[PDB]
Design a protein around this ligand. Structure first.
Ligand code: HEM
Ligand SMILES: COc1ccc(C(=O)O)cc1
Length: 393
């Protein structure tokens, strides 16, 4: 009843061009079995959305990577939010929600926007840049570590640690084992910066520690919650901004619409998140026998959700393979859906919005003028290098 496929969604060939294989996965049926890794897969929007929104049946506390924490030891102490289920999830989630809240965004927006404008001004003086290193990486690194309250020294560990975390959700392939082999210095830096004395007053990390006296989290839970923001708070924003620049370079008609109405900047970034989905996949583990899309899945089975595929499912989206900055993006699953839906989404959207706004107001053309190189990661999609020429408006 369930089609079995040999597609390896964690292979370099798949990463290099995933979209034909994602169509094969969608069109094979609502639920597939991936023989390479002995997991179930769902690649259509309907089933991905259903799985995300049933956390009791499709839990997170046995890990959201391939590994089942009931069977194997986690490679680091589990996240108190990403790898927890309700009710344990609920109060740590509330703390991070308040730390990264709508009200917090007001306190950081002016500085984030000023830094985005300053970066584009700097880049226009150079003309020919690498939109990854010099823009997609450089801009988040110029605002988010400061907003965290991190010291200056050791920040070179942040992107490597995030890539390690992302690779470690994958299967035990070469990408994962090489990441773990190289992990020790990055883990040591990150774990140390999570301690309260190392986080500057008023920043995200200090605010997490300040919540330890409300009864929502204890003092010994705050370092792991800081760790969540150091794990998740940079690499997907980098990939999303790079994806947005890539899209504006490949679809010049959309850059022209953005220039003509810069208030489209927020939705142009949201559409980039749908179109390139920086987080491609997450797993759940079944806690009982369950019927999903006409399939019976036993207890204790891993279920791989294809978020990027769900965001390009023609059953849900009109012309899913077009980048359209006025698309109604509401409902895409690039940030997840339901109780675990990205708690940092307002930070990511703020950064993406103000960077695309600066581009919309200052740049007349973005032309690729060198070889584009892909960055390979078991769970993240994004570019390694994006040589562009920026023409000033
Ligand atoms: C474009 C940028 C981003 C993308 C595409 C993205 C994607 C996602 C997705 C798909 C999830 C759902 C995980 C699941 O259902 O198992 C998630 C959760 C989460 N994200 Fe983001 N994320 C981004 C930016 C950020 C930022 C900037 C932060 C922190 C400042 C952050 C922190 C978190 C945390 C802590 C969780 C776990 C939430 C929970 O389990 O309740 N993310 N993200
Ligand atoms: C979206 O990716 C991540 C990665 C790590 C964590 C965490 O460490 O809590 C959360 C989300």
């Amino acid at each position: 009843t369930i089609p079995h496929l040999a597609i390896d969604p964690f292979s370099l060939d798949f990463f290099d061009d995933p979209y034909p294989d994602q169509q094969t996965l969608r069109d094979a049926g609502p639920v597939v079995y991936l023989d390479k890794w002995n997991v179930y897969g769902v690649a259509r929007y309907a089933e991905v959305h259903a799985v995300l929104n049933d956390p009791t049946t499709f839990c997170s506390s046995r890990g959201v990577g391939l590994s089942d924490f009931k069977k194997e030891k986690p490679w680091r102490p589990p996240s108190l939010i990403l790898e927890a289920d309700p009710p344990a999830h609920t109060r740590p989630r509330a703390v991070l929600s308040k730390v990264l809240s709508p009200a917090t965004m007001k306190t950081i927006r002016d500085g984030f926007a000023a830094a985005a404008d300053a970066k584009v001004d700097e880049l226009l003086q150079r003309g020919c840049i690498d939109a990854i290193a010099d823009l997609a990486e450089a801009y988040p690194l110029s605002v988010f570590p400061d907003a965290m309250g991190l010291k200056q020294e050791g920040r070179e560990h942040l992107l490597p640690y995030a890539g390690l975390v992302a690779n470690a959700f994958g299967p035990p392939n070469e990408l994962r084992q090489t990441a773990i082999e190289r992990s020790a210095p990055h883990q040591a830096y990150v774990n140390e910066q999570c301690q309260r004395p190392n986080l500057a007053p008023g920043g995200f990390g200090a605010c997490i520690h300040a919540f330890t006296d409300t009864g929502e989290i204890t003092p010994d839970e705050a370092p792991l919650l800081v760790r969540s923001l150091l794990s998740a708070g940079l690499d997907t924003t980098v990939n999303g901004i790079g994806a947005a620049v890539y899209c504006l370079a490949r679809f010049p008609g959309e850059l022209q619409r953005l220039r003509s109405d810069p208030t489209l900047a927020r939705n142009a970034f949201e559409e980039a998140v749908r179109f390139e989905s920086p987080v491609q996949t997450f797993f759940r583990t079944t806690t009982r026998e369950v019927e999903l899309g006409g399939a019976v899945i036993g207890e204790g089975e891993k279920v791989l959700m294809f978020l990027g595929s769900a965001n390009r499912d023609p059953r849900r989206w009109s012309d899913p393979d077009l980048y359209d900055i006025t698309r109604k993006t509401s409902g895409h699953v690039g940030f997840g859906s339901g109780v675990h839906m990205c708690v940092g989404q307002l930070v990511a959207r703020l950064e993406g919005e103000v960077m695309l706004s600066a581009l919309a107001r200052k740049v007349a053309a973005i032309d690729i003028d060198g070889p584009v190189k892909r960055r390979f990661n078991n769970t993240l999609r994004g570019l390694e290098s994006l040589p562009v020429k920026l023409t000033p408006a």
